Amino acid sequence: MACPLEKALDVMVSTFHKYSGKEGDKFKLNKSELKELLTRELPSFLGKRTDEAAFQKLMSNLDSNRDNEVDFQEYCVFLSCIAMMCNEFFEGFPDKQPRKK
Amino acid sequence: MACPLEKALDVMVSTFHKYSGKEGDKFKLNKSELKELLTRELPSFLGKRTDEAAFQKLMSNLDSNRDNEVDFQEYCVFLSCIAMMCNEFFEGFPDKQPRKK
Amino acid sequence: QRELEDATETADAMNREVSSLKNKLRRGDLPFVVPRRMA
Numbered sequence: 001m002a003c004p005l006e007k008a009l010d011v012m013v014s015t016f017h018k019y020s021g022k023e024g025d026k027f028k029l030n031k032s033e034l035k036e037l038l039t040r041e042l043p044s045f046l047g048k049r050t051d052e053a054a055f056q057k058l059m060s061n062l063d064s065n066r067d068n069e070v071d072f073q074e075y076c077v078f079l080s081c082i083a084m085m086c087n088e089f090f091e092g093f094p095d096k097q098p099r100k101k
Numbered sequence: 102m103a104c105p106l107e108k109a110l111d112v113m114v115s116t117f118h119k120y121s122g123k124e125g126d127k128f129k130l131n132k133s134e135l136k137e138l139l140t141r142e143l144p145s146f147l148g149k150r151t152d153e154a155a156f157q158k159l160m161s162n163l164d165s166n167r168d169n170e171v172d173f174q175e176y177c178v179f180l181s182c183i184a185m186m187c188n189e190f191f192e193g194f195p196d197k198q199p200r201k202k
Numbered sequence: 203q204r205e206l207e208d209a210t211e212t213a214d215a216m217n218r219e220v221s222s223l224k225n226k227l228r229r230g231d232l233p234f235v236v237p238r239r240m241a
Contacts, residue, residue, distance in 0.1 A: 011108070012106075013188060156233065185220060186224045
């Protein structure tokens with residue numbers, strides 16, 4: 001197996017250069033770049049059902065400078081916030097209903 | 102191999118719970134928790150060596166409240182601050198252009 | 203499905219500190235840093 005936490009940072013810049021250097025810059029991801037990125041290595045974080053709709057809030061929340069182009073700045077906070085995601089998405093609240101009465 | 106980008110977020114919360122639940126909380130990392138964390142899965146990212154007189158500075162750079170205990174978002178910005186800090190190195194910008202680097 | 207709504211919502215938050223934090227990690231008082239590669 002790989003070095004878990006090491007690969008985290010490694011694949012960040014690795015995958016960062018994978019799908020961004022498709023349309024334009026290798027450090028700049030427009031919608032379609034992130035799209036393919038997530039569809040490939042983050043499909044679990046897409047529910048296997050991501051159109052430009054689920055990506056709308058994604059791109060939006062990433063776009064902190066508000067130009068709609070995820071620079072590395074918007075990218076690191078993309079992933080690190082998916083850490084925080086993955087802790088809730090760990091169980092992923094799959095209809096968790098307790099009965100107190 | 103593992104799912105590169107997937108393991109990134111996965112190991113975030115995974116390793117997050119590994120070394121934190123050593124002294125205190127499983128979502129709270131004091132100096133010694135991050136220490137072992139980095140020594141194990143991020144030894145490459147020590148660049149030279151994580152010392153103890155250095156860790157007082159380290160923790161303080163991963164704690165904007167300075168309680169010597171990294172919270173979840175600070176743990177993850179920690180991560181992205183490694184990745185984003187790696188930008189110039191891994192991408193191929195040897196201190197070239199003080200813009201997006 | 204739209205985890206990225208609640209997930210990377212915080213990205214805009216972390217992003218402001220990230221650029222400052224990644225700056226304090228490279229400040230020089232830090233013991234740890236990214237090597238030329240992943241070494």
